[PDB]
Paper text:
Overall, the interface between J038 and C1080 Env trimer buried 1298 Å2 surface area from the antibody and 1439 Å2 from the HIV‐1 Env. Glycans N156 and N160 on strand B of V2 loop on P1 contributed 45% of the total epitope surface. The 18‐residue long CDR H3 of J038 formed extensive anti‐parallel β‐strand (main chain) hydrogen bonding interactions with the V2 C‐strand of protomer P1. Through the two base GlcNAc, BMA and the Mannose moieties on the D3 branch, glycan N160 interacted with J038 heavy chain by forming 5 hydrogen bonds with N30, R54 and Y100D in all three CDRs. Interestingly, when J038 bound to the Env trimer, it induced the V2 strands B and C in protomer P1 into an “up” position. In the J038‐bound mode, the tip (Cα of residue 165) of the loop between B and C in protomer P1 moved 11.6–18.7 Å away from the apex compared to positions in other antibody bound forms.
One major challenge is the extraordinarily high level of genetic variation among global circulating HIV‐1 strains; up to 30% differences in the envelope glycoprotein (Env) which is the sole target for neutralizing antibodies (nAbs). A lineage of J038 bnAbs is now obtained from a long‐term SHIV‐infected macaque.
Numbering used by the authors:
A (entry chain I), C (entry chain H), D (entry chain B): 519 to 556, 564 to 661
B (entry chain G): 31 to 136, 136A, 137 to 187, 189 to 309, 312 to 321, 321A, 322 to 355, 357 to 405, ...
E (entry chain A): 191 to 243
The structure:
């Protein structure tokens, strides 16, 4: 019922019901069309900004798909992992997190530790795959 | 039933018509001659030694010649390559000034091997003297050069000439160490597209083809440029095929594509020597110094009987589309020199052959078979140096003379005709086709008529009785 | 065994046993080769068509992989789903589909609703994750 | 612990505890930065040698992600497959592979057959998807 | 006299606001590539290196 970025002001609890709205639009764009009409049109000043707009869109998509591949969350929107939040990243209660906080505010106050959560989330998945090799 | 659930299949064989950016792949065995060709440069990626062609069995696909986008891409590539090959090297802005030409006097061999006995190059060239600037701006030198009469125009003061291009554009000399040899070029698609090729041997321009096959990219296509007769082409498989966008619209050219070649054997028997002057700092202008030895007009010989039978077959095919009329050919009725005369290229020299003995005759009823003796048709040919290949889009060029004797052996795999319009008051059951006509694109429609570019849609959705195992 | 598009005229039943032949060739191409021999050759007329034929190959691969990620079918060739057919899209029987049509005709009958079947597929996968986060 | 490629000399069984170190650096680089300071700055000599470095990074990453998707190993670092080893590719025992060779030495030993193992692995996954369609 | 270059080419004048000072340049690989460096100090041109980094 919401548009793109329509839930940026809502609380985290009510803004997680519109995840697909912001997820359908990481590749789709106007840029993929050719032109109004087809010198050297491929090296016009605006024929180059379109070439680098296509590469930027592809790379932006592949920066998040790269992580989901390592974390084991490929093909999922809400992926539940096995890394225990140790409350050093944030000690706020479950109520205070999902009930007056927005997704923008939450990302800011844990912005110091995302460089460490990313490496922990990768190591847990690797330890999962080693355990299956000598178990099956 | 009630147990149908959406199931996603990935990789299904579906496609949609689309347009893409075809790139070039050419065989490296032909290259590595260090010749720096214009078209099939070293930039083209190596081709697959074993290309794959898959016979698609049960599918009929609507092919549409005369609306293929593959042709326009080839046109733009040809024009762009032609422009970028002329960019680096010498111009001709200090060259053309008020010339002064007089009839040439030559010392030459006498018999000249008068087997064809066509003519003599006198009254075609002029031995003109003019003042140019040497490597130093403050020093002018008087130099002489031999120019064909088709390259110089006569301004006022009739004993004073100018080059043909000065008041319209500036031309750059054809650049000395590059080649005009057409090396075959394959047009390959990105990964995600395919080329459908119609394998019907008797296939007109447009319509539903029933014998489609799939390829990654086309066969070798030579970018050879000609006007009235398709040269170095690929023969038709079934029979003579007459293709036109609409056969009842005389503004539309007719392409007659043959299934048996008629070799044309062209030569320039003259002996032109090449000399070089300097018109600026590091800029060298090449010219024809003298004509010593054999002096004869360049000519092209054709087997008379082969061409005669070929015209018989072409008329036999043409009578089917025009049922109750006689078919009569006639020479071109006017236009530029690139239209009225068969234009082509050999080793950098640009030939314009007359071709009027090939193209007029009458075929009233085939009442009786007429038997003759073997004859060789000798078409006279002129040679031009100031070449404006494309009328207003391509850079004007000056092709330097080539030392030695020039000889080409080429195939005639097609003809470009243009029906003469008819009237209503009186049609005496006759139709006249005059050669030439059309644009340069028709030289490449003759090759890209089998191919269509399609985009693969590998995501399919169909119902199935399977249901995803929902986790508890 | 058939080649690329070799079973495009066969019925959906027998054309679905060769899905891998048309799936191995969505990124592999001749374009990854460098040249016949290695100014500014990256700007030649033949050197710009080769740059845009590499971006086209990448983009055409991602627009089909992006959908697979959202529907939960990543890493699978044939992917079942919990979305029921309403027969408004197509009211044919089972035999009339898998034994009486080719893949091209089928994709032309439901060309109306693929813009809507994609949205139903995305919502179902999202509803699988919400129903699984608030359940474990 | 080791850095990038740091365990290239260790044996197969001991250098497999550092797979995440070389897997985290297939898209991340320095190239994504714009410049020291931003005519037509995108046609400089080093504006094209950087544009084609961004495209080479994408194709190198997508080249292996395509195979992982076909084989059914998306979102996994170590993936077990149902393809038996026929020992004609290599008949070395368990202790002569994981405790005696190197990942470079091993991959050069079976370089003959990797073009066939890729086909076998892809087709085996296709058979698994056919089986579950006629099973659920 | 005449200028030395007046028969070979024409020379554009070295251009006032640019500098010829060589600033160090680092040649870096894209992602997915790496540069092996041979750390042997007494290393001649060709051959095997034993402490590659
Ligand atoms: C091997 O390595 C060796 C070590 O690196 C190397 O030797 C070094 O070579 C470089 C060559 O660039 C030397 O750098 C130059 O040094 C010049 C010395 O200047 C003296 O005189 C000045 C008075 O004119 C003094 O002010 C100056 O003292 C102070 O100088 C600096 C301020 O300029 C200050 O920061 C210092 O701390 C010091 O206190 C010194 O006594 C110097 O003049 C020259 O400056 C140019 O380059 C600077 C950047 O490095 C610019 O900031 C500066 O503005 C100058 O640029 C101008 O000239 C350039 C070249 O023409 C142009 O490109 C610029 O655009 C700019 O030109 C504009 O301005 C002009 C007016 O000035 C105007 O007319 C123009 O039209 C234009 O608008 C530079 O720093 C270095 O000193 C050498 N090392 C040693 C130890 O001597 C050796 O060459 C290497 N080997 C080989 C084979 O290369
Ligand atoms: C329809 O199709 C036919 C058949 O393909 C085609 O005819 C052929 O045309 C080509 C192109 O002109 C001809 O190739 C040239 O032939 C001449 C003839 O030389 C004879 O003598 C030498 C001994 O000196 C023999 O070795 C040779 O075999 C011939 O018998 C050659 O001299 C040409 O050589 C140039 O190109 C070579 C390419 O590798 C170079 O290696 C060589 O050094 C020459 O290059 C010179 O000129 C370049 C500019 O052109 C310059 O850049 C270089 O630096 C150098 O100075 C060339 O091989 C071929 O013989 C024809 N074949 C027949 C049977 O006639 C028709 O042309 C075509 N129709 C149309 C309209 O195109
Ligand atoms: C913007 O903030 C206002 C609060 O001022 C939100 O309004 C509240 O919404 C919740 C849930 O819908 C209700 O329970 C409250 O009663 C509302 N309060 C008021 C004063 O209206 C509003 O929903 C927010 N908008 C968005 C898009 O998140
Ligand atoms: C609900 O959110 C509000 C604000 O987002 C929190 O209340 C704020 O408390 C701080 C003191 O820590 C005050 O300075 C602010 O003025 C308060 N906000 C408002 C709008 O008055 C509150 O803490 C949150 N709920 C809980 C249970 O912590
Ligand atoms: C479809 O096109 C193919 C093109 O190869 C045809 O195959 C040729 O058909 C002719 C006509 O009988 C034979 O003389 C050739 O031997 C066939 N093979 C080749 C390589 O030319 C084929 O006949 C066409 N029609 C069908 C129904 O397949
Ligand atoms: C080229 O096509 C022509 C058709 O125009 C073929 O000519 C026919 O040849 C057969 C031979 O069996 C004759 O029976 C027909 O009468 C000819 N047709 C006409 C209109 O004369 C010719 O055979 C083909 N040649 C090749 C090599 O394919
Ligand atoms: C193309 O023309 C050349 C010369 O015009 C031919 O070579 C001559 O052919 C005649 C034919 O009777 C011979 O008498 C000469 O001895 C040949 N050589 C010379 C130097 O004149 C050549 O054969 C022609 N090619 C074709 C295919 O007809
Ligand atoms: C074109 O004309 C020039 C000058 O009129 C000729 O140049 C002279 O030719 C004679 C021939 O007997 C030589 O003796 C002279 O040495 C040449 N130079 C000068 C400065 O007189 C030139 O030969 C003519 N070209 C042709 C092909 O006839
Ligand atoms: C020109 O073409 C005719 C064919 O119309 C050639 O005549 C044939 O020549 C061959 C070989 O000499 C004979 O076996 C045939 O019997 C001839 N007639 C036919 C109808 O084929 C003639 O040789 C060609 N001219 C040249 C110079 O080769
Ligand atoms: C091609 O050659 C023919 C002759 O074979 C030329 O036709 C002649 O043109 C002149 C020019 O006015 C007429 O006076 C003659 O009556 C024409 N016929 C003959 C038999 O000479 C034709 O002009 C030539 N092509 C071009 C473009 O000039
Ligand atoms: C000119 O035409 C002749 C005959 O049509 C060609 O000679 C044959 O060309 C085919 C190409 O499909 C080759 O497979 C044959 O080996 C050639 N010789 C014979 C005796 O059939 C000749 O190649 C054509 N010339 C050009 C430049 O294409
Ligand atoms: C290079 O080879 C040496 C010799 O095999 C390795 O050193 C041994 O490593 C194992 C593994 O833990 C130890 O148990 C041994 O005590 C080590 N010494 C000897 C003499 O065997 C060394 O680890 C190898 N390099 C790397 C990076 O693993
Ligand atoms: C290979 O090169 C490395 C360079 O890092 C050597 O390690 C250094 O060697 C120098 C000279 O012997 C010492 O001064 C340093 O303390 C060493 N360590 C570092 C971090 O620089 C290494 O020894 C070389 N390989 C062998 C087998 O000697
Ligand atoms: C909790 O995470 C923080 C992240 O910086 C880390 O410093 C700390 O050691 C962790 N505590 C435990 C018990 O793992
Ligand atoms: C030149 O051409 C004319 C034209 O017929 C001819 O009469 C003459 O013999 C030829 N040769 C010379 C040397 O004039
Ligand atoms: C070239 O210049 C000289 C002297 O300037 C003059 O005598 C001669 O007639 C000129 N030749 C031309 C204009 O063809
Ligand atoms: C081509 O021929 C087929 C039958 O041979 C016919 O159905 C079709 O209309 C024709 N197309 C044209 C453009 O003449
Ligand atoms: C053609 O011109 C060259 C140029 O010097 C000459 O050597 C050759 O002998 C001439 N041809 C004949 C047949 O004399
Ligand atoms: C071509 O064939 C026709 C048949 O009507 C004949 O009249 C004509 O003389 C032939 N041409 C040649 C050059 O033999
Ligand atoms: C072919 O040439 C002319 C062209 O108009 C034509 O009138 C004539 O009848 C034909 N034959 C000859 C020998 O000219
Ligand atoms: C079938 O499509 C219609 C189209 O509006 C839709 O309303 C309906 O909900 C669909 N079927 C089911 C079971 O949802
Ligand atoms: C092992 O190789 C043999 C022959 O090369 C082949 O028959 C067999 O299928 C291979 N193993 C597997 C699991 O495919
Ligand atoms: C493994 O294969 C090689 C090559 O065929 C053979 O020489 C060797 O005996 C084999 N090892 C065993 C244990 O069979
Ligand atoms: C470098 O030295 C080593 C050992 O002295 C030797 O093996 C190698 O061949 C030498 N390389 C050259 C190019 O001399």
């Amino acid at each position: 019922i919401f548009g793109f970025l329509g839930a940026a002001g809502s609380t985290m609890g009510a803004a997680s019901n519109t995840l697909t709205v912001q997820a359908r639009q990481l590749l789709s764009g106007i840029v993929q069309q050719q032109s109004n009409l087809p010198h050297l049109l491929q090296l016009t000043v605006w024929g180059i900004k379109q070439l680098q707009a296509r590469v930027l869109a592809v790379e932006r998509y592949l920066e998040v798909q790269k992580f989901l591949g390592l974390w084991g969350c490929s093909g999922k929107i809400i992926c539940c992992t096995a890394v225990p939040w140790n409350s050093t990243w944030s000690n706020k209660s479950f109520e205070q997190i999902w009930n007056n906080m927005t997704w923008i505010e939450w990302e800011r106050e844990i912005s110091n530790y995302t460089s460490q959560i990313y490496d922990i989330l990768t190591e847990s998945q690797f330890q999962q795959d080693i355990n299956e090799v000598d178990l099956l | 039933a009630e147990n149908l659930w959406v199931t996603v299949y990935y990789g299904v064989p579906v496609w949609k018509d689309a347009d893409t950016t075809l790139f070039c792949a050419s065989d490296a065995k032909a290259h590595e001659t260090e010749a720096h060709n214009i078209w099939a440069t070293h930039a083209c990626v190596p081709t697959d030694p074993n290309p794959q062609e898959i016979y698609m069995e049960n599918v009929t696909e609507n092919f549409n010649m005369w609306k293929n986008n593959m042709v326009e891409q080839m046109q733009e590539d040809i024009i762009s390559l032609w422009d970028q090959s002329l960019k680096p090297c010498v111009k001709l802005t200090p060259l053309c000034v008020t010339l002064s030409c007089t009839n040439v006097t030559l010392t030459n061999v006498n018999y000249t091997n008068n087997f064809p006995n066509i003519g003599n190059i006198t009254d075609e060239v002029r031995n003109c003297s003019f003042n140019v600037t040497t490597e130093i701006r403050d020093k002018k030198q008087k130099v002489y050069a031999l120019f064909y009469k088709l390259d110089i125009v006569q301004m006022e003061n009739k004993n004073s000439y100018r080059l043909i291009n000065c008041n319209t554009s500036v031309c750059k000399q054809a650049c000395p160490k590059i080649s005009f040899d057409p090396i075959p070029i394959h047009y390959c698609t990105p990964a995600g597209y395919a080329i459908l090729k119609c394998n019907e041997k008797n296939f007109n321009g447009t319509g539903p083809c029933k014998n489609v096959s799939s390829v990654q990219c086309t066969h070798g296509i030579k970018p050879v440029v000609s006007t009235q007769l398709l040269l170095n082409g690929s023969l038709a498989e079934g029979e003579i095929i007459i293709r036109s966008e609409n056969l009842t619209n005389n503004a539309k050219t007719i392409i007659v594509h043959l299934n048996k070649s008629v070799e044309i054997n062209c030569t320039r028997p003259s002996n032109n020597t090449r000399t070089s002057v300097t018109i600026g700092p590091g800029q060298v202008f090449y010219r024809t110094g003298d004509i010593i030895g054999d002096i004869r007009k360049a000519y092209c010989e054709i087997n008379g009987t082969k061409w005669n039978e070929t015209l018989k077959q072409v008329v036999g095919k043409l009578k089917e589309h025009f049922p109750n009329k006689t078919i009569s050919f006639q020479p071109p009725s006017g236009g530029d020199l690139e239209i009225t005369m068969h234009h082509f290229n050999c080793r950098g020299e640009f030939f314009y052959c007359n071709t009027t003995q090939l193209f007029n005759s009458t075929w009233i009823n085939s009442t009786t078979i007429k038997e003759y003796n073997d004859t060789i048709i000798y078409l006279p040919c002129k040679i031009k140096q100031i070449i404006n290949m494309w009328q207003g889009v391509g850079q004007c060029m000056y092709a330097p003379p080539i030392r030695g004797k020039i000889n080409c052996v080429s195939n005639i795999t097609g003809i470009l005709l243009t029906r003469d319009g008819g009237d209503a008051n009186a049609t005496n059951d006759t139709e006249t086709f005059r050669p030439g006509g059309g644009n340069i694109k028709d030289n490449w429609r003759s090759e890209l008529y089998k191919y269509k570019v399609v985009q693969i849609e590998p995501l399919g959705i169909a119902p199935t009785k399977c249901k995803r195992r929902v986790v508890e």
